[PDB]
């Protein structure tokens with residue numbers, strides 16, 4: 277679990293994602309696809325995207341960015357009483373989308389990167405440790421549901 281102070285830090289930082297949810301979400305997805313181009317094949321509608329400028333110019337990619345970060349926002353605000361939120365998310369990602377836990381680790385990393393990049397020296401040692409622990413918990417709780425289901 278995180279501590280109370282650790283959640284407060286997580287949620288304060290998520291305060292800044294919510295000022296520009298679309299632009300954060302899009303930078304997240306662009307970090308992901310360019311560092312890990314196999315993740316791009318999971319999206320039928322994004323594999324016409326050969327360049328960054330193409331990625332950067334896509335409103336549909338930004339739309340997905342928002343869907344992603346909005347649902348993570350909800351999850352985070354439940355502070356690890358997040359089972360009702362998280363369980364059907366895990367099921368769709370295992371059975372339908374077929375997203376390996378490794379791609380989830382890649383997007384966690386992309387979110388840490390994007391918080392540092394968009395908030396240079398405003399996202400400190402302490403806040404970065406708590407967000408990492410919060411994303412680890414997210415990932416741990418999905419991994420458990422994945423194991424149940426035999427996914428990988």
Ligand code: MNH
Pocket residue numbers: 315316318319320321343344345347348364365368369373375379380383
């Ligand atoms: C945090 C990480 C994270 C969150 C909160 C997340 C939340 C969602 C939500 C909400 C939806 C819409 C409802 C659903 O269950 O289909 C959705 C659809 C999707 N998700 Mn994912 N998703 C990922 C990471 C996430 N997704 C990653 C990483 C992959 C890709 C490599 C991915 C690929 C999808 C695909 C593909 C869809 C369906 C896209 C479409 O509409 O065509 N994702």
